[model samples]
Target: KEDSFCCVISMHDGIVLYTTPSITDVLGYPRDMWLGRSFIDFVHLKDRATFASQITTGIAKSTFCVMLRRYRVSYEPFRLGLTFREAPEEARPDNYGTNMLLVICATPIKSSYKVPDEILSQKSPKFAIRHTATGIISHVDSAAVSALGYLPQDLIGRSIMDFYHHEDLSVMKETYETVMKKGQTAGASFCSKPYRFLIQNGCYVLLETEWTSFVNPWSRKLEFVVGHHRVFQGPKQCNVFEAAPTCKLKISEEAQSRNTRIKEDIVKRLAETVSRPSETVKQEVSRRCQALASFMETLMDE
Candidate 1:
């Protein structure tokens, strides 16, 4: 009787028409207590407004259902629950004198559902390699392999910490732990570490590792992960306001040129209307030309 199930209640009045026995087991509240209390009272305050609106709309359409509602029952808080199915229109023989609706509560049949495909196959190219608490690589992508000069098959199941320079190993270890627990890091850079590894051709090359966080859908968790290691070439520099930046300025100039061309076309059309005999047509042309002239002046200033 104490299986995972859903509870149904009346949206119009705060009446617990029916609930599965599992509710009492999960929330530590008796069936009788739910019968008269406002269902909103159990709902988490942050979700009340959206939940109430959806419930109201469902009731209005006579088809109410919800999936994931967090609630607090008795003194405990943040219990995840959901509502499924509505009660039928027949009165029960055992409760002939009761005016409440007949509802049934039952735990969700877990075996009936499969793990979502999106969650399983979801790929984030942004993440190169993610490490576990033990400093082992838990996940890796193709970008990581290319950057680190390793084949996808070669890097799998490797300890990422092994490559850290002996001097930076302690700092990387401390920062990795802090980031896993706190979800953020400060004043950390891949340049802090320097190390050498042999390429497939039997030549030694220096490398350094970068790291960041990537969201993992399968575990519904955040992971602090390592990025690809590259040769420690000195930092490349560029002028912020040079040719690359001036390219954006060129785009604005082209846009302004196009606007001027459009205004010239409009003025040419307005000139054709100036010789019209109708007073109204002449006045309309004059007004439109004045507006266009003002806009052209503003554009010139820019």
Candidate 2:
């Protein structure tokens, strides 16, 4: 099978054994040519690094109980999207000698449409990170340093998974897979849902962000995901929480200046909030127009 879009090869790091005829149709390489060589030779160079990273992770993570399923991968050679089977198989188990083998199924991705790789600017969107398909962080915005309590050097070259909340990874796994299967059309992104990002100092930050997927100029494939995130208050703890009257003695401070006059409100005041059409969820950290009355008085006996 030389021109087949589907291909099967060893999971033990390339070493392709049998490539279908359809390989010619998809990659223009003769099936037999790939059969005797390292399968990685067929992949685009830029994608090989990402490809290596994913397979090792998938193999190390797979277990006998985890049943074989499609593992998403990108074929940048010709800008093809591909999926590899996760489970390793026992090849020639019935032969005179047992030979353990792993076969990966590679397929091409077809997106409904293409999105132009255009650049837009803004106040450079404070919270931002650029990463490859395999989750390696390439760039971190200056604001992201303060947001994550990390220096640019500390975050770059690390796996994005390292900072993600354990809960978020599983939730995102499927979404990432779907993007691969769909190959990313004009509107491909994964930030529609509110995600709980784990803060460095052991806290949960609820964030809603815009995730953008477009082609990489050099690679010419939709393989990188960049996210613009903003920190907003959560509904659970937005109240003025130093609690009641006894809380008043906590500290002393001089008059603080405000850019605008404060409004006298009893409860639930909004300030610089996250705007939404229907208001699915809302919270703002800073509240203005709130004043604490001084209840403690010291009588002077002259």
Candidate 3:
């Protein structure tokens, strides 16, 4: 399936809190390697500071921040737009509790690619459209219209219910409820799942979509859903990306004297946290919000 160039990263203290699987496409590193690892580990050493600065600035404000930085994919050099934002506490994961910091979306830095992560995270005004409270499209953006492979025509007056995959409806409704609830308190809200896009083309791709709300000039209240749906493609085959399952990381030592005591200290904190991010990031414990209802049913039937 043809896909857009984007992926999300949740970060704090220079570490990746969460990452989208499409990371494989952007940096050639399998998604698993990104977890609990210092983002700078994959960043070109020379550009690490530049990248960190962008992250810091993003944390300073609740809105979008932009800059350019270099990264190595497949051991070759290329640049990407380092865009970061503060993911809201209302959207704070039920687990992370701390909600501790930023969300970054990366895109190739080039002429054809102009959208930055900051802007896309908003109403996805890029692909946005006005909607009824029930969530029907009333008006849309040209960029999003073209990107969706739609002709120059109004897709207005269509209810998302009319086209979205039936199997996905339950999860979609759950997602909408979550957004409507949390989204009111926070400026933006997001949820992820795989749905068969009505594209007469590909079957399905795991996608993470976030929506933006706005007041209708006449209705005088929030009544719009500017959507940014990233068509996420996870690794198709573990074999293909054998080309680049990699990164650099710091190491540690073993000593019953100091290390054993350190482990014991962590053992104490474990009683509190149950498990820390370092321990948890290794597995996909939280898939954005929930496991796929479709995937869950498969295992249930088995």
Candidate 4:
């Protein structure tokens, strides 16, 4: 992590497209805060002229490499490397792939500047949550609201299983069971496998938690499981720098076809129940079903 530098992908005009989360390590800004902003803002005022012009001519050539001062605790010099390329289809600014893009990689050229230990130690945002032995959440750190976009109260009184992605449910259960099975001889404190947790938004956030199951003094039973959950920020979407790409979106397509089959079965049963009786009833049902099909099409388009 210390050796890695920050990478920025932006439009030719300097509008930020995406940047690695490591920007916080090198610069003092959160990765998402840079989105939709000009890359020039990160450059020192005195160096903006050089930076701007480099980008202009850099487009003419395939690559541009220069040393420029970056804004931070002080004006720190960094080796900046720029590349010009066509944006990927999914990452294009608009419908066409004709858009030219800029990829900037920045590395600190000097060791004089120091990032405070307090800031560097916190590699990722983490929070604590306590739940019953049955996995019902009883308490959560307020940090959840900022880190995962859920109020403490919103998560309380609900089973943690409710927020787990369908694909990772089995892994979560297996981990829990393995921990419980070895409760006596093995250490109770363990790190669970990385799994996706459903955030306030429709998307998911990757989480890997260190957990400890403790026994109740009164009940003399393993009554609580406490976890320090760390959120992973990487190449995920919906929220820049805070989420990892979710591949399960294709599963929704399977649900779509299953629902279509269910609707077809219902229509068949309706026609059979009436024994093909009245032409007027069949026409009305058919019209209503057609309306439903069109409504489904609209949803798919969105």
Candidate 4 lDDT over residue span 1-302, tens digit each: 23335555667556887787877777656768778887776665645656667766766343322233333444444556687777765654456436677777776543211321112125556789887766678988755655565544457788676676665544665666655543433345778867778765446666778877665444444666678888754213433212334444645554556544444443232222111123475578787887899999999999
lDDT of 2 by residue, 262-297 (tens): 111100111111111342434331232132112122
Q: What TM-score, computed on C-alpha atoms, does each candidate reach?
A: 0.27, 0.33, 0.32, 0.39
Which residue pairs clash in candidate 1? Answer: 4-107, 4-108, 5-106, 5-107
Rank list by lDDT:
4, 2, 3, 1
Candidate RMSDs in Å, in order, are: 25.1, 24.3, 26.5, 21.9
TM-score of 4: 0.39
Give residue 99's lDDT in candidate 1 (0 to 100): 35
- Cα error, residue 44 of model 2, in Å, equals 39
Candidate 1, residues 1-302, lDDT tens digits: the string is 43454456664466666566666665556655676656766654544664566545543122221222323412222213334344454464552322333233333211111221112122311235666534456765644332233433344567554444333434554545444433323223343354544322222334455655443434534534555554442111121101122211224454556544444443232222111123365578787887999999999999
RMSD of 4: 21.9
Q: Which stretches of candidate 2 lie over 4 Å from their true place?
A: 1-126, 181-183, 186-190, 216-221, 234-302
Report the backbone clash tally of model 2: 14
The collision pairs in model 3 are 123-226
lDDT of each: 0.42, 0.45, 0.45, 0.58
Q: Is candidate 3 or candidate 4 better by lDDT?
A: 4
Error of 4 at 277 (Å): 73
The per-residue C-alpha lDDT of model 1 at residue 43 equals 56
